[PDB]
Design a protein around this motif. Sequence first.
Motif: not given
Length: 210
Positions: A12-21, A41-43, A47-48
Amino acid sequence: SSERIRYAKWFLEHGFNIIPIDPESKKPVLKEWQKYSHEMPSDEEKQRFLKMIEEGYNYAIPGGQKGLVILDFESKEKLKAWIGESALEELCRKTLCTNTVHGGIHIYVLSNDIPPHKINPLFEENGKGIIDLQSYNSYVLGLGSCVNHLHCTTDKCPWKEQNYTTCYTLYNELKEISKVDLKSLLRFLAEKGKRLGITLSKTAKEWLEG
Ligand SMILES: [Zn+2]
């Protein structure tokens, strides 16, 4: 904190999007996660997502975004014999590479010219795929994510049904994901592997040859 949250935050620090799993299903939390290869994803979601990760959820990194593609090799040993140690060490010296929980290796790279979709498989050996190219609408689990092999009931798992948990770890050191000429790389892989009988899949050759 755990390593899973530290690294998730690093992406996230480097601008990449991540997804929970991973809890019950072993699939993204959102049904429409594929969109995260194309947008943020939108702020009030980011955080969620972190909270979920900080609490036991593994996470994944969608391909495509920022020119990202992940070469997911089934076996780190096979790739070693495929391109030789120096080549491998060179590749994983300039860009982020990680160990998978089943003996494979993920090579992350950025490229100005990448496939519009994942290519599974990218290369084949004796009629079987030995590496998948993950791009838009595909993902790879992220560093720190862990898997309990107790629930792996296939031979694709070397630790089949053992009460043993391993995680996605650094191949060597943490480094930024760097740019490459994907096509140059796929060609380097082609030649290097022609002697071992490892060839581009038809879908891969058509995207490469154009
Ligand atoms: Zn397993």
